Coordinates of N, CA, C and O in Angstrom, one line a residue:
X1 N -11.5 95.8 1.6 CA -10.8 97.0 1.1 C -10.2 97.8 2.3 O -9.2 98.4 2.2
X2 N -10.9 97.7 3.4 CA -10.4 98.5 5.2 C -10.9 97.9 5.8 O -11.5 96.8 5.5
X3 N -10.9 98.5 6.8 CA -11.6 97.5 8.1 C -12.7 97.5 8.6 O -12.9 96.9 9.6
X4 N -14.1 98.4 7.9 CA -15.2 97.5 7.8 C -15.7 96.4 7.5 O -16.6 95.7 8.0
X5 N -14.7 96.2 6.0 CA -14.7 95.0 5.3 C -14.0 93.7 5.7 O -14.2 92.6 5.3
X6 N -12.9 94.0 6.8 CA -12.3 93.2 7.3 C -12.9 92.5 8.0 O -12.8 91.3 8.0
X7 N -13.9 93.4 9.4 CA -14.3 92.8 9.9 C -15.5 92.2 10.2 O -15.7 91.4 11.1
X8 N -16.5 92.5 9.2 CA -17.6 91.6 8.2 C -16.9 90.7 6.8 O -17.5 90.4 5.8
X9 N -16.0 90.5 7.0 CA -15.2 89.2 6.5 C -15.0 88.1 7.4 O -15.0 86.9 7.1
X10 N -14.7 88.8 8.7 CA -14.1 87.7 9.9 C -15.4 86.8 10.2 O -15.4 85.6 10.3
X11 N -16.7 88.0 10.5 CA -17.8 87.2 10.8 C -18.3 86.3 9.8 O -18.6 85.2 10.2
X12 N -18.3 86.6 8.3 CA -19.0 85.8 7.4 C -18.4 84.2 7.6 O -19.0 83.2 7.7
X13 N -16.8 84.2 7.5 CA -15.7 83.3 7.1 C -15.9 81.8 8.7 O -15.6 80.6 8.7
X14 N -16.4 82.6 9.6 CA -17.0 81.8 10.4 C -18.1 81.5 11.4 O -18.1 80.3 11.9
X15 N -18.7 82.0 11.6 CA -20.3 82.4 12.0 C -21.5 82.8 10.5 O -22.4 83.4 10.8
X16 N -21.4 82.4 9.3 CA -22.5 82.2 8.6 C -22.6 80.6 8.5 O -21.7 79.9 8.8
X17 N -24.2 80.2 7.9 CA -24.2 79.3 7.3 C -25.6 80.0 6.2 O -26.2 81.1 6.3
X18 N -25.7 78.8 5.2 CA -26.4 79.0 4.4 C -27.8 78.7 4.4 O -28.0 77.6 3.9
X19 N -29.1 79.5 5.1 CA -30.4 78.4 5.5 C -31.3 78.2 4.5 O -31.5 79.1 3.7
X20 N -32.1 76.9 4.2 CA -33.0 76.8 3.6 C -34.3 76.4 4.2 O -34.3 75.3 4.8
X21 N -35.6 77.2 4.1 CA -36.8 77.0 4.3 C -37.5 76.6 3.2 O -36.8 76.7 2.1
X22 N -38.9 76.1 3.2 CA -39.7 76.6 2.1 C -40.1 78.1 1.6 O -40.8 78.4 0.6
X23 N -39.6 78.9 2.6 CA -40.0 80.6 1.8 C -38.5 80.9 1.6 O -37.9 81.9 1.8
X24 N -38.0 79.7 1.2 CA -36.3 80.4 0.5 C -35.2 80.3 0.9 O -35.2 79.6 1.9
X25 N -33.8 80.7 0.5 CA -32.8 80.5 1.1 C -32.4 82.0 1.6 O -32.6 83.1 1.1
X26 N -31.5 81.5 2.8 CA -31.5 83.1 4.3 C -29.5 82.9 4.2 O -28.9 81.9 4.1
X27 N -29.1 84.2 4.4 CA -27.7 84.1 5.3 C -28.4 83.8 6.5 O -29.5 84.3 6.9
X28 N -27.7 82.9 7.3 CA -27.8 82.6 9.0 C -26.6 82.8 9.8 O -25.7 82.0 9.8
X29 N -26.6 83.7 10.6 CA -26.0 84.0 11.7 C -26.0 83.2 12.7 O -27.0 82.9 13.2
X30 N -24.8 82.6 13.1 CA -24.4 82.1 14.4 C -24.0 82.8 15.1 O -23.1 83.5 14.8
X31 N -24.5 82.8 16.5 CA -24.0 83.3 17.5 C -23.3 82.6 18.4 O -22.1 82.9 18.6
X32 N -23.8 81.6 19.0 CA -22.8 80.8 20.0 C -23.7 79.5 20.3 O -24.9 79.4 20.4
X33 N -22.4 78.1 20.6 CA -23.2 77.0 20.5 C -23.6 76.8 19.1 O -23.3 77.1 18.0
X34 N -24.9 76.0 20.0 CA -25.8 75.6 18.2 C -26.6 76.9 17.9 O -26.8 77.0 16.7
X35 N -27.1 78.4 18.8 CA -27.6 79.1 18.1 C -27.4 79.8 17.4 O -26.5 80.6 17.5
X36 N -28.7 79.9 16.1 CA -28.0 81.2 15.4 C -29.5 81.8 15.3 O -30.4 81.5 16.0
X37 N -29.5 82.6 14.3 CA -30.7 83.9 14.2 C -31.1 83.8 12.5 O -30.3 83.4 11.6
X38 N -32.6 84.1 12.5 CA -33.3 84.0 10.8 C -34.1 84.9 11.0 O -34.7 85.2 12.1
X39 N -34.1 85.6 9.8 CA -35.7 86.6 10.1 C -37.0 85.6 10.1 O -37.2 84.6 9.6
X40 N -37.9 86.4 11.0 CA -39.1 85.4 10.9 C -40.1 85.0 9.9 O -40.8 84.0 9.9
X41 N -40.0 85.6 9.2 CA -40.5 85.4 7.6 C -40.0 84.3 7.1 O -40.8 83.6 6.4
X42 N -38.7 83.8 7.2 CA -38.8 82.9 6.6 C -38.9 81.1 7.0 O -38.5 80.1 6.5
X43 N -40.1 81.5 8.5 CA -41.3 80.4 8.7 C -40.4 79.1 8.9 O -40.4 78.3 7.9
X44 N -39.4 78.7 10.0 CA -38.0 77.4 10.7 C -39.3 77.0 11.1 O -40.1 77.8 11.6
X45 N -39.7 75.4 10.7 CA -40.5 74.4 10.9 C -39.4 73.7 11.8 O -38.5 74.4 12.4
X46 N -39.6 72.4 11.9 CA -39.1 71.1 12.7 C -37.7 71.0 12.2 O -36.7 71.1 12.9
X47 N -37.8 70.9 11.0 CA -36.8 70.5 10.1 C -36.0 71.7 8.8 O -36.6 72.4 8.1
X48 N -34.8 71.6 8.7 CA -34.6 73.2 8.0 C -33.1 72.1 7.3 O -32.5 71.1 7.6
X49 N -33.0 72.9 6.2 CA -31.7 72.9 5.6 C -30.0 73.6 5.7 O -29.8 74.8 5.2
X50 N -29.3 72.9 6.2 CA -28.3 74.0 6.6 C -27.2 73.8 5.9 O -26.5 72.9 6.4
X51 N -26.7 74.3 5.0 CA -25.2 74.3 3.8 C -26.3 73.0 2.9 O -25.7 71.9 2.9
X52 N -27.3 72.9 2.4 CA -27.8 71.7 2.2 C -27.8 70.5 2.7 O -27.8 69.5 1.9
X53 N -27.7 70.4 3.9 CA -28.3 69.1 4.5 C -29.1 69.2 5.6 O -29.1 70.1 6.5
X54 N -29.7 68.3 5.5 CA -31.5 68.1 6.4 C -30.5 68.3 7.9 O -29.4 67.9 8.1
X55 N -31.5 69.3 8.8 CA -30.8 69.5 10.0 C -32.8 69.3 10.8 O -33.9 69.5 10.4
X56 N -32.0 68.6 12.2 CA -33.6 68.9 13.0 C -33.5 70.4 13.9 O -32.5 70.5 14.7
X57 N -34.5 71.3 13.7 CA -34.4 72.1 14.9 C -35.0 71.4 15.9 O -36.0 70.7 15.8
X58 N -33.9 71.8 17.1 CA -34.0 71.6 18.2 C -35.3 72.5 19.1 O -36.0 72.0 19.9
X59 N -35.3 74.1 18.8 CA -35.9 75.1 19.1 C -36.1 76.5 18.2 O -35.1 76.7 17.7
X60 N -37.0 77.3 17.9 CA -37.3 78.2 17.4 C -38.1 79.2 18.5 O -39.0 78.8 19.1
X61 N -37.6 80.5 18.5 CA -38.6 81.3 18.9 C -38.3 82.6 17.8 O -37.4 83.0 17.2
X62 N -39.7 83.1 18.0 CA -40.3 84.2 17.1 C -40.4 85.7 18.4 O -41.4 86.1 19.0
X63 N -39.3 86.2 18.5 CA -39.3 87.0 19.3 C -40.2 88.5 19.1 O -40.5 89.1 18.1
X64 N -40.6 88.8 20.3 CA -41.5 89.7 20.0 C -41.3 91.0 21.4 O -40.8 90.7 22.5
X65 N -41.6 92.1 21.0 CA -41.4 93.1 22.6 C -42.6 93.0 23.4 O -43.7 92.6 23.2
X66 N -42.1 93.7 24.7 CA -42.8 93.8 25.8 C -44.9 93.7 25.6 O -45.7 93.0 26.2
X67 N -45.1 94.7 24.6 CA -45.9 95.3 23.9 C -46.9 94.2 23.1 O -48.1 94.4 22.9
X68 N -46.0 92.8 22.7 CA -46.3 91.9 21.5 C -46.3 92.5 20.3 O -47.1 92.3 19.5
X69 N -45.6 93.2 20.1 CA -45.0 93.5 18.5 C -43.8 93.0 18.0 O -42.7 93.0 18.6
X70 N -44.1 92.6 17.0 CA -43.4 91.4 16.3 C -41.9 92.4 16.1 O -42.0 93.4 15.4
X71 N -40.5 91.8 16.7 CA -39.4 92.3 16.3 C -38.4 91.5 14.9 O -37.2 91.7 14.5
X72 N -39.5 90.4 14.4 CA -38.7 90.1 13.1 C -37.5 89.1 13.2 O -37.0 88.7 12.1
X73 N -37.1 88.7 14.0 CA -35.9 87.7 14.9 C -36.6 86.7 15.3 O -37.7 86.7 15.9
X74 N -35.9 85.4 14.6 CA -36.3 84.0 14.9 C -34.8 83.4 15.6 O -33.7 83.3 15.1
X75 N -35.3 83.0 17.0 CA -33.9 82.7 17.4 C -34.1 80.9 17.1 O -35.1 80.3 17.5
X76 N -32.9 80.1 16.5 CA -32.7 78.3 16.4 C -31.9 78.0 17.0 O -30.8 78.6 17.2
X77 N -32.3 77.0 17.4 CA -31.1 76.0 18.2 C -30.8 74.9 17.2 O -31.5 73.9 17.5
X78 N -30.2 74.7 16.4 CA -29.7 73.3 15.5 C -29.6 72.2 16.0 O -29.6 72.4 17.2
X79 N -29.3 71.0 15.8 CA -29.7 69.2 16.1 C -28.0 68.8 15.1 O -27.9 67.8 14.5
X80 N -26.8 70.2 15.4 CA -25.2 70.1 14.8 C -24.7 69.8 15.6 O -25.0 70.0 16.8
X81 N -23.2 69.0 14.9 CA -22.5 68.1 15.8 C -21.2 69.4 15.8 O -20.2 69.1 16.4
X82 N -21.3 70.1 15.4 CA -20.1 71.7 16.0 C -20.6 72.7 16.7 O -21.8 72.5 17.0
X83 N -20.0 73.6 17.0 CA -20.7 74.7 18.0 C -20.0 75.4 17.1 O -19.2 74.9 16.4
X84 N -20.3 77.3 16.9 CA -20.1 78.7 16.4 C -19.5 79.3 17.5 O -19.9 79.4 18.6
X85 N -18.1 80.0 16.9 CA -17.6 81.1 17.4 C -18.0 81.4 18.2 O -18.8 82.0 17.5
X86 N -18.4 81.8 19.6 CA -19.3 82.4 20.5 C -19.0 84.5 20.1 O -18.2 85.3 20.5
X87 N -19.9 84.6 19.4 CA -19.7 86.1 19.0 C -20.9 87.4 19.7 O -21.3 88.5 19.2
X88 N -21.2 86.5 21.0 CA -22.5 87.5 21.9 C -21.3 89.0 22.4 O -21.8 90.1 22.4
X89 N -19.8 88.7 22.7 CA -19.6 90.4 22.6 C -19.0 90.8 22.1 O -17.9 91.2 22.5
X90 N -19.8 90.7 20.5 CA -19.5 91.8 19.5 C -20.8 92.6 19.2 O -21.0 93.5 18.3
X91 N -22.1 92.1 20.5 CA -23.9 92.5 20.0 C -23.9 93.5 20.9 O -23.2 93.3 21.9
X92 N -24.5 94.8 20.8 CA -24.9 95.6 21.5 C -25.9 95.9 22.6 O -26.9 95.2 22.4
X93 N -25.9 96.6 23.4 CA -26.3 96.3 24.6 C -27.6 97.2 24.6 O -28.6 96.8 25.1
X94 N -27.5 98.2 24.0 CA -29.1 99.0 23.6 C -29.2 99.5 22.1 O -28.3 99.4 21.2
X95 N -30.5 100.1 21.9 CA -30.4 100.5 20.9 C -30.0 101.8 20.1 O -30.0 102.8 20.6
X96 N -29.7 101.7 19.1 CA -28.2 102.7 19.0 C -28.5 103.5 17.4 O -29.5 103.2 16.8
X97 N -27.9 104.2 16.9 CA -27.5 104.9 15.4 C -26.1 104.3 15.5 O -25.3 104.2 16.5
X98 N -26.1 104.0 14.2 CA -24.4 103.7 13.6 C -23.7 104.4 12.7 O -24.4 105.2 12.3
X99 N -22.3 104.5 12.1 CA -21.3 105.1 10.8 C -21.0 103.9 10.3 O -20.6 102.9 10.8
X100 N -21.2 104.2 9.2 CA -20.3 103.1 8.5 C -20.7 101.4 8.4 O -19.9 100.5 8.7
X101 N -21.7 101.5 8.2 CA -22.1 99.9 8.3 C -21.7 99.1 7.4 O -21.1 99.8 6.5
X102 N -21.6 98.0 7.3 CA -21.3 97.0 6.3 C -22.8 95.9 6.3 O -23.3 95.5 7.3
X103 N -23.4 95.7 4.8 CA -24.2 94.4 4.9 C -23.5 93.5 4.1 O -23.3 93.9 2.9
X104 N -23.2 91.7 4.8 CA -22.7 90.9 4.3 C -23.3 90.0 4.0 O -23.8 89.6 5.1
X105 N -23.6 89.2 2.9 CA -24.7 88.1 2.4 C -23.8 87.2 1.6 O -23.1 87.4 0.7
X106 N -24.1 85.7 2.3 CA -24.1 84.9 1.6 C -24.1 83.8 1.0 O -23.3 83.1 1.5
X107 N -24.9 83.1 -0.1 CA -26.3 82.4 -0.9 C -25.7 81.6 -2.0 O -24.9 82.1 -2.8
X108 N -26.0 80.6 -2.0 CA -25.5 80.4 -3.8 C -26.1 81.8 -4.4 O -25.2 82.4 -4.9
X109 N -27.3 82.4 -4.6 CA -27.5 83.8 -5.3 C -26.2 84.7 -5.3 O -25.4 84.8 -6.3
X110 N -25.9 85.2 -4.2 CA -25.1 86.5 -4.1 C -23.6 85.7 -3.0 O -23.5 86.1 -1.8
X111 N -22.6 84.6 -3.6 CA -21.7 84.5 -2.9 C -20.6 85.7 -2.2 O -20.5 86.8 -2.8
X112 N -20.1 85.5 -1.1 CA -18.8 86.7 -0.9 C -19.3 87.9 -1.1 O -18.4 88.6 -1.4
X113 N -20.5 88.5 -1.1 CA -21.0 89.6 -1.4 C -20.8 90.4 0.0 O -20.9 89.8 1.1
X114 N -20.4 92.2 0.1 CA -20.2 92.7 0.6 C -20.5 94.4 0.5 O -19.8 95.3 -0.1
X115 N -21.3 94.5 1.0 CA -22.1 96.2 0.7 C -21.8 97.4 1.9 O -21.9 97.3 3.1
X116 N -21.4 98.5 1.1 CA -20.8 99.1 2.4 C -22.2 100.3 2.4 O -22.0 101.3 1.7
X117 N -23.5 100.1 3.1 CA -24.6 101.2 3.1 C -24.6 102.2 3.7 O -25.4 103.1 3.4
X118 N -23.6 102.5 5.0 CA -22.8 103.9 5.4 C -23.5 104.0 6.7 O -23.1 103.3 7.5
X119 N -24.3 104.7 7.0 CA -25.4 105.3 7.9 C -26.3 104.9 8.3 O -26.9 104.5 7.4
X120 N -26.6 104.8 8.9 CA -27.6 103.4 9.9 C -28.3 104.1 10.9 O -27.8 104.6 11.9
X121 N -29.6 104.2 10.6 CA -30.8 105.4 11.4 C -31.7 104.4 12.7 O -32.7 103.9 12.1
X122 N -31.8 104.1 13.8 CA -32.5 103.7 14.3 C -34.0 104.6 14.1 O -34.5 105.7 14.6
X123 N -34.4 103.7 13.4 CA -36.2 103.9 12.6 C -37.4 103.6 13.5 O -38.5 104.1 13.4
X124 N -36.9 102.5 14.2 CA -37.8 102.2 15.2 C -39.6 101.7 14.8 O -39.9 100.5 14.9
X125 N -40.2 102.3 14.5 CA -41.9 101.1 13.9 C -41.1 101.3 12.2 O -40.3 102.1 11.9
X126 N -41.6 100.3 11.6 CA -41.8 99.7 10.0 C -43.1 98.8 10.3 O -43.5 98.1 11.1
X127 N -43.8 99.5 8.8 CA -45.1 98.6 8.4 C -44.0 97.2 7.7 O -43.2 97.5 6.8
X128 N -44.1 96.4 8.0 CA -42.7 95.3 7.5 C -43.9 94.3 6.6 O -44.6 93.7 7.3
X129 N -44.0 94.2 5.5 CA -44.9 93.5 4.3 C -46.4 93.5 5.2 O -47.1 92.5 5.0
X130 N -46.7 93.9 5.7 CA -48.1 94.5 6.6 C -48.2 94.3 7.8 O -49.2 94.4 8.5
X131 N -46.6 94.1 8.2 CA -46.8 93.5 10.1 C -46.6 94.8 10.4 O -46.3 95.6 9.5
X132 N -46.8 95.2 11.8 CA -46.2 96.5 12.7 C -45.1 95.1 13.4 O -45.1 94.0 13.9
X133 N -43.8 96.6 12.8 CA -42.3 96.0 13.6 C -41.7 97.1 14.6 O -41.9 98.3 14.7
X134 N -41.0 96.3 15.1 CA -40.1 97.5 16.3 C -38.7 97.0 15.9 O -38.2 96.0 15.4
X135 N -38.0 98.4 16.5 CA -36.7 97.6 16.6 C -35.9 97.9 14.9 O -34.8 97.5 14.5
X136 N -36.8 98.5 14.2 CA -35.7 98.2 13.0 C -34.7 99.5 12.7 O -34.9 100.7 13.0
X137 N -33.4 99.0 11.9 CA -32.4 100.3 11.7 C -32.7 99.7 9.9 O -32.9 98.6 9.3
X138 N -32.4 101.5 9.5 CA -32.7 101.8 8.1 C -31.2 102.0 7.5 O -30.4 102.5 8.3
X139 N -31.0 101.7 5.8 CA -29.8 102.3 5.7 C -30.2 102.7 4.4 O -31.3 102.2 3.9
X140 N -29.6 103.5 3.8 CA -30.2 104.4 2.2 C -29.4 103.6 1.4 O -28.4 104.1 1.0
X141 N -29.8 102.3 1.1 CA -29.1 101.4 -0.1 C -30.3 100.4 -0.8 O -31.1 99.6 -0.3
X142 N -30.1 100.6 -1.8 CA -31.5 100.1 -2.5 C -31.1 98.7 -2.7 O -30.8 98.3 -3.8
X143 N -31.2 98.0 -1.4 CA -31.3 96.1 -1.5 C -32.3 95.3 -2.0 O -33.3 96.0 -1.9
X144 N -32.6 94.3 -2.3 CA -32.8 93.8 -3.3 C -33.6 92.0 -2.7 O -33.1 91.8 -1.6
X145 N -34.4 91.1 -3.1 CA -34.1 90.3 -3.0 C -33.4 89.4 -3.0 O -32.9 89.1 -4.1
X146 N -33.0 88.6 -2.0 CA -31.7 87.5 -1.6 C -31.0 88.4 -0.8 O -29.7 88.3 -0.8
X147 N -31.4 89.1 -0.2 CA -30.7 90.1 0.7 C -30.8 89.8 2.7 O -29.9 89.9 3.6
X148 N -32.0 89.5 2.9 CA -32.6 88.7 3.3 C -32.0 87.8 4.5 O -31.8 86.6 4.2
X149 N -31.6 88.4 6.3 CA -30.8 87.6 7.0 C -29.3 87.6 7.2 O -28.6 86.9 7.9
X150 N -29.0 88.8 6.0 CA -27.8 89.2 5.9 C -27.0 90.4 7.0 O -27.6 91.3 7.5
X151 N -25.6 90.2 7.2 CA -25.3 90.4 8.4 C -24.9 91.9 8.6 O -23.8 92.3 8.2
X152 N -25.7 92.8 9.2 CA -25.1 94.2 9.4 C -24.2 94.8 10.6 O -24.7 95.1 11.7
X153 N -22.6 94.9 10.1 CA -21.7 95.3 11.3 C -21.6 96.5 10.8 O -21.9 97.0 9.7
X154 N -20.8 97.0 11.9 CA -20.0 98.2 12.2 C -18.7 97.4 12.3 O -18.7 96.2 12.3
X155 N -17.1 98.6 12.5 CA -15.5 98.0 13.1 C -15.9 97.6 14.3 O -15.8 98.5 15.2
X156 N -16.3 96.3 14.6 CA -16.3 95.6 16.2 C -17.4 95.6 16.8 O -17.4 95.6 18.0
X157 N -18.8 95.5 15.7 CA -19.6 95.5 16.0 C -20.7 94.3 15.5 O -20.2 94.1 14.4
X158 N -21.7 93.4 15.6 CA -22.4 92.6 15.2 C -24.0 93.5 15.3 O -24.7 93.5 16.3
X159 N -24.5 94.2 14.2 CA -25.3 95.4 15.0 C -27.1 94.8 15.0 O -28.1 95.1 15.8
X160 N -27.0 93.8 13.5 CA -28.5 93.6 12.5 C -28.1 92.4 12.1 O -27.1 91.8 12.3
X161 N -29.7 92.2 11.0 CA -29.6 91.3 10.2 C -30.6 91.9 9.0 O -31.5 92.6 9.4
X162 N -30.5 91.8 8.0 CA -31.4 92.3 7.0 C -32.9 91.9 6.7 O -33.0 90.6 6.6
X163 N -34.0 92.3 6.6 CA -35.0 91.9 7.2 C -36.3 92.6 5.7 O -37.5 92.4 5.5
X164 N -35.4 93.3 5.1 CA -36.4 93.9 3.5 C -36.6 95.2 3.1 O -35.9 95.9 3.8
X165 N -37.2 95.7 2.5 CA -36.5 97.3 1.9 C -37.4 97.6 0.8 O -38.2 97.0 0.1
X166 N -37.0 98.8 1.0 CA -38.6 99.7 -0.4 C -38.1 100.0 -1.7 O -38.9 100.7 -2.5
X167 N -36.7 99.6 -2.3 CA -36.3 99.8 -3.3 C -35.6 101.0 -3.5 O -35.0 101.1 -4.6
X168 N -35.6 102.3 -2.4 CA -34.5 103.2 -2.1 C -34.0 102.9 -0.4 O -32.8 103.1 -0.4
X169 N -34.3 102.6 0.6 CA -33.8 102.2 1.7 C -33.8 100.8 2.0 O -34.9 100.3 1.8
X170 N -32.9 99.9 2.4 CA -32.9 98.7 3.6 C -33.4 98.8 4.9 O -33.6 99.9 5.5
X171 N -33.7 97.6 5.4 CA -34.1 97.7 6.8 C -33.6 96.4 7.5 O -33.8 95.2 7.1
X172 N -33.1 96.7 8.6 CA -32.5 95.0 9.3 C -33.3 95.1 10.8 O -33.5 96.1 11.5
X173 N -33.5 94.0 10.9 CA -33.6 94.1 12.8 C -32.7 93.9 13.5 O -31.8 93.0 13.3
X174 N -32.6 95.0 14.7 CA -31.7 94.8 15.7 C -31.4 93.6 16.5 O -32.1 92.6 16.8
X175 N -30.2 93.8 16.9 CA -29.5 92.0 17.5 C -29.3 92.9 19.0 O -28.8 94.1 19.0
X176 N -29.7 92.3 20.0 CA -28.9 93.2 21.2 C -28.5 92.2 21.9 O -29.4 91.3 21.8
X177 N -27.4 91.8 22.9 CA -26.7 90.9 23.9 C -27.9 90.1 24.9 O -27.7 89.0 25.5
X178 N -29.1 91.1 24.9 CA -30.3 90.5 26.1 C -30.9 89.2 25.6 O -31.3 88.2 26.2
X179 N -30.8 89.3 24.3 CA -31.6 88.2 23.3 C -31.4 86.9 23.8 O -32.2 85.9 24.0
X180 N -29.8 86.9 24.2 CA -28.8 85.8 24.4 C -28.3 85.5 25.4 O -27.4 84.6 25.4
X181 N -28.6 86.2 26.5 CA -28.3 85.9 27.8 C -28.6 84.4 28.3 O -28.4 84.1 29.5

């Protein structure tokens, strides 16, 4: 519709794929190369599904802060014969408040789907389904399951990923450039 949407169109159209675990199917974020990013919840074994076909991970980590508190980011390396966009500077460099966000998802559930949640609060701890999390940004949009991994920009921004929500607010974990160094 403008150019929030435009440009959480650009990312979806080439940097998503579709993940499947056994706790479900995820939007997956590519960032560069074979990697891309999952929330950790949804438990990358050996082997994972990607657009439906059997893929080997190569690597998983379950990233966590200084502290050991769990930040909710599973970074993969895929066993694919293409490489992703390299989209590390469109990630931000610290942690930030946003205008205008966009969350983009998309699942056989929710294809081409596009939510514009506006306001973007760095929230910082979430009891996250009973973990202590860091790192999360909140937006006042009542998301839903299959929401789940989905990609939160700003205009020229790569900021989140969607990570779960209380039925009046979302919540994503932060993406920042150090991840990927």
């Amino acid at each position: 519709m403008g150019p929030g949407f435009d440009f959480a169109q650009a990312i979806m159209k080439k940097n998503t794929v579709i993940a499947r675990t056994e706790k479900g199917e995820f939007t997956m974020l590519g960032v560069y190369d074979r990697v891309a990013v999952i929330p950790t919840h949804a438990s990358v074994g050996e082997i994972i599904y990607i657009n439906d076909v059997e893929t080997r991970v190569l690597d998983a980590c379950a990233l966590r802060d200084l502290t050991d508190t769990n930040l909710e980011i599973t970074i993969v390396k895929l066993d694919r014969n293409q490489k992703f966009r390299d989209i590390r500077h469109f990630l931000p460099r610290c942690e930030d408040d946003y205008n205008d966000a966009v969350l983009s998802v998309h699942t056989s559930k929710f294809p081409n789907m596009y939510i514009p949640v506006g306001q973007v609060t760095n929230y910082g701890f979430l009891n996250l389904g009973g973990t202590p999390t860091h790192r999360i940004l909140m937006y006042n949009f009542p998301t839903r399951a299959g929401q789940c991994g989905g990609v939160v920009t700003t205009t020229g921004k790569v900021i989140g990923i969607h990570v779960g929500g209380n039925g009046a607010q979302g919540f994503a974990a932060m993406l920042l450039h150090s991840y990927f160094t």
